[PDB]
Amino acid sequence: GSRNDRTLRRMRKVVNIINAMEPEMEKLSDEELKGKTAEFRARLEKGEVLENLIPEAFAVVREASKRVFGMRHFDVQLLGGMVLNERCIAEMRTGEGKTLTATLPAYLNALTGKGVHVVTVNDYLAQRDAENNRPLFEFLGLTVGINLPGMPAPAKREAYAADITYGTNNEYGFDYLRDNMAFSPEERVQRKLHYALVDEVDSILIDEARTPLIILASITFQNYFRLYEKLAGMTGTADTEAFEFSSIYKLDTVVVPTNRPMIRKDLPDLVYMTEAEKIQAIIEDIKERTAKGQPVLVGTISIEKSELVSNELTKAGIKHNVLNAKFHANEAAIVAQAGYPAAVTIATNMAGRGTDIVLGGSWQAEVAALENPTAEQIEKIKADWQVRHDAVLEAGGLHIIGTERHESRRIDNQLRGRSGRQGDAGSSRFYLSMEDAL
Amino acid sequence: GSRNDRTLRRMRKVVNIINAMEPEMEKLSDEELKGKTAEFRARLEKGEVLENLIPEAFAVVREASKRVFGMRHFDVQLLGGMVLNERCIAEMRTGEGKTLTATLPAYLNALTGKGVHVVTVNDYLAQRDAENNRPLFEFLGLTVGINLPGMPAPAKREAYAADITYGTNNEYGFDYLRDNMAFSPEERVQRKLHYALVDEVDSILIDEARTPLIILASITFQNYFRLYEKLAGMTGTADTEAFEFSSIYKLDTVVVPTNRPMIRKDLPDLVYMTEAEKIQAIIEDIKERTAKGQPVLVGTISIEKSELVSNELTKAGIKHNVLNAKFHANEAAIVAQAGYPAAVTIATNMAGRGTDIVLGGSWQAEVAALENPTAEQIEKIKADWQVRHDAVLEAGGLHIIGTERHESRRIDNQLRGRSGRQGDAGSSRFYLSMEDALMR
Ligand SMILES: Nc1ncnc2c1ncn2[C@@H]1O[C@H](COP(=O)(O)OP(=O)(O)O)[C@@H](O)[C@H]1O
Ligand SMILES: Nc1ncnc2c1ncn2[C@@H]1O[C@H](COP(=O)(O)OP(=O)(O)O)[C@@H](O)[C@H]1O
Ligand SMILES: [Mg+2]
Ligand SMILES: [Mg+2]
Numbered sequence: 001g002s003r004n005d006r007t008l009r010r011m012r013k014v015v016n017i018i019n020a021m022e023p024e025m026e027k028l029s030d031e032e033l034k035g036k037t038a039e040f041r042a043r044l045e046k047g048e049v050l051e052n053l054i055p056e057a058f059a060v061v062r063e064a065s066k067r068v069f070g071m072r073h074f075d076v077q078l079l080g081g082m083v084l085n086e087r088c089i090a091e092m093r094t095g096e097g098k099t100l101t102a103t104l105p106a107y108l109n110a111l112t113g114k115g116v117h118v119v120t121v122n123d124y125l126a127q128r129d130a131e132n133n134r135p136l137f138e139f140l141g142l143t144v145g146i147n148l149p150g151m152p153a154p155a156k157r158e159a160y161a162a163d164i165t166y167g168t169n170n171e172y173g174f175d176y177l178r179d180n181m182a183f184s185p186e187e188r189v190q191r192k193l194h195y196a197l198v199d200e201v202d203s204i205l206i207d208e209a210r211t212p213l214i215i216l217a218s219i220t221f222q223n224y225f226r227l228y229e230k231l232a233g234m235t236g237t238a239d240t241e242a243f244e245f246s247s248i249y250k251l252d253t254v255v256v257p258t259n260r261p262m263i264r265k266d267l268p269d270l271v272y273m274t275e276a277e278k279i280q281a282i283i284e285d286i287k288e289r290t291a292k293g294q295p296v297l298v299g300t301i302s303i304e305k306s307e308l309v310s311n312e313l314t315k316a317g318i319k320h321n322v323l324n325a326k327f328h329a330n331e332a333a334i335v336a337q338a339g340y341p342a343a344v345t346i347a348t349n350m351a352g353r354g355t356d357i358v359l360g361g362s363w364q365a366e367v368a369a370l371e372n373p374t375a376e377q378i379e380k381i382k383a384d385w386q387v388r389h390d391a392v393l394e395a396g397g398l399h400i401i402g403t404e405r406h407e408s409r410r411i412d413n414q415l416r417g418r419s420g421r422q423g424d425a426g427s428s429r430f431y432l433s434m435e436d437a438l
Numbered sequence: 439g440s441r442n443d444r445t446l447r448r449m450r451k452v453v454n455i456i457n458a459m460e461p462e463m464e465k466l467s468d469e470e471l472k473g474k475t476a477e478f479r480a481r482l483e484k485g486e487v488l489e490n491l492i493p494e495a496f497a498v499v500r501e502a503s504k505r506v507f508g509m510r511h512f513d514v515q516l517l518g519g520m521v522l523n524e525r526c527i528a529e530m531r532t533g534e535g536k537t538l539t540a541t542l543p544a545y546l547n548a549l550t551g552k553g554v555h556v557v558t559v560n561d562y563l564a565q566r567d568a569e570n571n572r573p574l575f576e577f578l579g580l581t582v583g584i585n586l587p588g589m590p591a592p593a594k595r596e597a598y599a600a601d602i603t604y605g606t607n608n609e610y611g612f613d614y615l616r617d618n619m620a621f622s623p624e625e626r627v628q629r630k631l632h633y634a635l636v637d638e639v640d641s642i643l644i645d646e647a648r649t650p651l652i653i654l655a656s657i658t659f660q661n662y663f664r665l666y667e668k669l670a671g672m673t674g675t676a677d678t679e680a681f682e683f684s685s686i687y688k689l690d691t692v693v694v695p696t697n698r699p700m701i702r703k704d705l706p707d708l709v710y711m712t713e714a715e716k717i718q719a720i721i722e723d724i725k726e727r728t729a730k731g732q733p734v735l736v737g738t739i740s741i742e743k744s745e746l747v748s749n750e751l752t753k754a755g756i757k758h759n760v761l762n763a764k765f766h767a768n769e770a771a772i773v774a775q776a777g778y779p780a781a782v783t784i785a786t787n788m789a790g791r792g793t794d795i796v797l798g799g800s801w802q803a804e805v806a807a808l809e810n811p812t813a814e815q816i817e818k819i820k821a822d823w824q825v826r827h828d829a830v831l832e833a834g835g836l837h838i839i840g841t842e843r844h845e846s847r848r849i850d851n852q853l854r855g856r857s858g859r860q861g862d863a864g865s866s867r868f869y870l871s872m873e874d875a876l877m878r
Contacts, residue, residue: 149654174655180618181661214650217587217612223621 004255011082014055015075021059030067036060037141040111054082054108061107061140065100068135074259077101084232085109089201089245089253094236094414095356095421096258099129102197103136105232110142110163114194117228118166121200123148124328125354129199130166137164147171156189169204170212172196173221193228200353201233202410205249206241225249236417240410264397264420265427269405271434278431279309282401283316285429286344290318294395295343297357299415300403306348309403313346320344323351336362341392349406353414359397359424360389397426405430442693449520452493453513459497468505474498475579478549492520492546499545499578503538506573512697515539522670523547527639527683527691529676532852533794533859534696536672537567540635541574543670548580548601552632555666557607559638561586562766563792567637568604575602585609594627607642608650610634611659631666638791639671640848643687644679660686674855678848702835702858703865707843709875716869717747720839721754723867724782728756732833733781735795737853738841744786747841751784758782761789774800779830787844791852797835797862798827835864843870 028036040053058081062073073081077097081104083090092098102118110116120126127146134144145162149171156175159165172190179188198204205225211218225231231249238245242253272278286296298313300306303324310322321338323331325348335352338345340361345352363385367378392398398419406412412430419426466474478491496519500511511519515535519542521528530536540556548554558564568584575582583600587609594613597603610628617626636642647660663669669687676683680691710716724734736751738744741762748760759776761769763786773790776783778799783790801823805816830836836857844850850868857864 170655174652177615177618177655178657180614181657181659181665183661183664212652212655214612214615214652217608217615217650219612219616219619221619223619226621 007252007254008079008257011079014082015078017055018059018062018078019075021056022062025059025063028063033060033063033067034139034141037111044111050108050112051085054085057108057111058082058104061104061136064139065103065136068139069100071100073097073100073104076257076259078104080234080256081105081108083254083256084197084234087231087251089232089238089242089251090234091238091253091255092234092236093258093262093421094417095424096236096256098199098234098236099133102199102234103133106164106197107137107140107142109195109230110137112194113163114229115160115162115191116164116194117172117196118164119169119172119196119198119204120166121203121350121353122168122328123171124332125199126166126168128332128354130164147175153187153189160190169198169208169221169224173224176224176227195230196225196228196232198225198231198233199235201235201245201251202238202241203235203350205233206244207411222248237410237413240408240413258423260423262420263423263425264416265425266416267427267429269430269432271432273434275433275435278403278433279312282309282403282431283313283318285401286313287316287318289396289399290342290344292395293341293391295339295341295359295392295398296345297338297398297400297418298344298346298403299351299400299412299418300346300348301406303348305403306346310346313344318344320346323347325350328352333365336365339392339398341388341395349411356421357398357418358389359392359426360385360387393425397424399427399429401428402430404436405432445690445692446517446695449517452520453516455493456497456500456516457513459494460500463497463501466501471498471501471505472577472579475549482549488546488550489523492523495546495549496520496542499542499574502577503541503574506577507538509538511535511538511542514695514697516542518672518694519543519546521692521694522635522672525669525689527670527676527680527689528672529691529693530672530674531696531700531859532674532855533862534674534694536637536674537571540637540672541571544602544635545575545578545580547633547668548575550632551601552667553598553600553629554602554632555610555634556602556604557610557634557636557642558604559641559788559791560606560766561609562770563637564604564606566770566792568602585613591625591627598628607636607646607659607662611662614662614665633668634663634666634670636663636669636671637673639673639683639689640676640679641673641788643671644682645849663687675848675851678846678851696861698861700858701861701863702854703863704854705865705867707868707870707875709870709872711872713871716841716871717750720747720841720869721751721756723839724751725754725756727834727837728780728782730833731779731829733777733779733797733830733836734783735776735836735838735856736782736784736841737789737838737850737856738784738786739844741786743841744784748784751782756782758784761785763788766790771803774803777830777836779826779833787849794859795836795856796827797830797864798823798825831863835862837865837867839866840868843868843874 058078066072080090080092080101084105085108106116106118130144130146137144142164143162145159145165147156147159147165147167175190179190182188211220238253239255245251245253289296300309306324313320321334331352332355335355339357339359363381366381400415400419402412402415416428419428496516504510518528518530518539522543523546544554544556565584568582572582580602581600583597583603585597585603585605613628617628620626647658649656649658676691677693683689683691727734738747751758759772769790770793773793777795777797801819804819838853838857840850840853854866857866
């Protein structure tokens with residue numbers, strides 16, 4: 001309430017400062033910029049306050065980013081970074097740029113030398129992120145490691161050896177369980193847990209409250225993140241159980257504002273008597289908007305209903321797509337194009353979570369699909385796509401339709417978010433069923 | 439070889455010493471005996487050498503035992519105790535008294551205050567053992583805890599709080615996994631791992647090293663016992679995989695000699711062509727010896743063959759019994775009576791492992807089955823049983839028949855051991871198939 005305000009206003013000013021250092025940093029040469037880290041390390045080494053070089057450090061990361069990726073951190077992203085450095089939960093909507101916002105607090109912390117642990121929901125994302133978030137990090141003179149399941153102890157010492165590490169909550173935890181069952185300390189792959197930046201905190205710290213089972217026993221990984229000196233998370237959904245975050249991990253939730261006004265239209269739930277009445281009113285809806293030239297993603301609670309709705313959808317003569325959270329790699333390729341004017345995708349709970357759905361398709365997947373990277377063909381794609389885009393927009397952007405509400409609204413909010421991002425005009429609808437009286 | 443000898447001879451002398459202190463300790467009053475622990479604690483507290491009060495400490499445990507249970511530790515048992523205090527694997531045959539031999543090294547170690555972890559193959563045994571091994575321990579002024587699966591954290595702090603604790607390898611391990619996923623140290627149920635005495639070491643440290651699957655992750659409790667300051671084990675089969683014990687846990691195997699000469703007769707494997715030829719030659723064999731008045735246990739590799747042989751055995755008109763390692767508690771009650779002159783039992787891999795099969799039945803289960811514990815009726819059982827006993831013996835004691843050899847001889851040796859214990863005359867037979875005898 002007035003608390004979220006005073007706290008946002010609080011650092012909102014520190015944000016203004018960062019923007020003031022922009023004309024300066026804009027001048028420092030590449031070598032002078034890169035070497036900005038040495039200075040920060042010395043400064044800190046001299047015992048200077050951690051949270052003291054935040055405005056200056058964040059100003060650097062923005063600059064490097066703008067130079068390496070050509071992406072200037074939105075001040076709202078800076079706002080988010082700051083929250084991520086305080087044992088807070090920065091809530092930022094889907095499409096807001098959490099992936100890049102983390103380079104900020106991950107850079108500030110990756111200076112002391114203790115390492116930084118960015119957590120993700122799955123292996124594909126963890127590596128994917130590290131992969132294309134690395135150039136910014138290698139520029140600023142840091143090393144990025146990727147921790148995965150089948151990595152021999154040697155490799156894992158490497159991935160945890162870097163200044164910045166990426167992995168999934170499980171593997172990190174599993175490594176910790178395995179390090180305790182270690183022969184000799186020199187056989188351990190981790191180090192003293194320092195800072196953990198959790199991407200999709202709710203998913204990781206709340207839904208993953210469902211114990212794993214050893215077979216016969218069962219344990220949880222709840223407390224694993226409480227062993228970290230610094231624990232911080234980010235998500236596009238947190239205010240729901242915003243109380244549980246502090247009752248366990250003592251994490252204060254800060255709802256960051258969006259960059260561009262959120263104009264997506266969340267339509268009222270239409271209730272039907274039978275499952276058939278539902279699935280039929282939706283295939284009738286997609287089939288409709290389809291012609292209109294508007295893309296539409298469908299969400300299902302489980303593969304179960306996902307399969308069923310898939311056939312009922314192909315039966316009405318409709319070429320759709322299905323993602324069951326099995327092949328993240330490939331699903332991701334597909335979800336990244338569900339923004340094409342004529343596109344229908346059926347995703348499950350954690351189907352293509354993590355891939356930004358650009359209105360009108362993603363031309364980058366188009367250019368990366370041409371052995372001949374010439375500034376000529378790209379133009380007839382970066383401008384060709386541009387057409388499909390504004391077209392899809394005029395057509396009300398992306399429309400998602402929940403086949404059913406989850407036990408937790410938070411969950412069936414993650415679905416909505418896949419739409420109307422970075423200011424995009426889109427819409428969402430939920431189709432409930434009376435027959436769901438179970 | 440000459441190594442096992444020099445090492446056995448080595449402590450064999452320390453054994454002689456223990457026997458010399460017997461006439462002395464025999465005089466100390468109950469209170470003076472019990473208070474023998476205080477002295478040991480003080481002595482050690484004064485910084486005296488651990489392995490220095492072994493001959494004296496073991497002499498005490500024998501005395502207390504002789505008094506509380508009325509069981510004087512065989513010197514060979516004392517031999518075993520010693521081995522169990524050195525990061526060794528004391529190999530002692532089935533029926534040799536491992537359960538009581540552990541009170542020795544478990545007492546020596548349960549003095550420093552760090553606790554002692556006796557490991558068993560299953561929950562039933564772990565509690566069963568603590569239960570009726572306690573009186574000796576409470577006498578000598580020590581507390582005994584029992585760690586089990588559904589015990590709330592509170593309870594578990596208790597069981598690990600005692601001087602001596604009993605549980606299964608898994609639960610101990612599981613506790614350790616759960617202690618690492620603890621909120622705050624004050625939420626942990628274990629203490630720093632000190633001494634672990636593994637009963638049935640091969641089973642626990644070799645067969646069990648099969649990796650539990652987290653659900654996805656794969657880890658092994660192989661290293662769990664390597665975190666213990668002191669690791670020691672005991673079994674009636676270790677000499678086989680004696681090399682793997684040191685290549686992982688660095689444990690030297692010591693083959694302790696038996697109390698009474700081992701006269702059981704292990705007969706040659708009879709190979710048959712078909713499974714029917716097998717199961718038929720065995721039901722023909724048990725049906726035979728049955729009449730003779732000799733009991734016979736059958737071992738199967740899995741419940742699979744166990745069920746099959748059970749029907750084929752009842753089909754020939756034979757009242758038998760079956761244990762599938764499901765209800766340890768009950769099976770145990772039954773295995774303890776498979777020594778009755780006319781008894782047929784079909785057990786699986788880990789069916790009634792742990793229960794000593796007395797020739798002629800177990801009268802103790804008979805006396806404990808009478809609300810009226812009078813010195814009168816017991817006599818007509820302790821002397822009545824005595825008849826069945828010598829009778830079963832003359833009939834060649836217990837005869838076990840393996841329905842099929844296991845991948846590891848060690849395993850199908852555990853079967854044999856269920857017979858001919860403490861000197862008993864018995865016999866064992868293995869019935870293989872042709873599509874096996876082709877060992878090539
Ligand atoms: N500061 C920025 N400037 C320009 N584009 C950005 C910026 N930050 C993020 N993006 C783009 O917007 C999308 C939103 O990023 P994403 O990683 O999917 O974050 P989130 O998890 O919040 O949805 C990305 O695909 C990225 O290409
Ligand atoms: N010192 C002893 N004096 C008398 N009986 C003993 C002694 N030690 C062991 N026994 C008996 O011999 C049997 C062997 O015990 P058990 O627990 O089955 O050990 P093991 O693991 O060697 O088979 C027990 O039933 C017990 O009654
Ligand atoms: Mg993301
Ligand atoms: Mg035993």
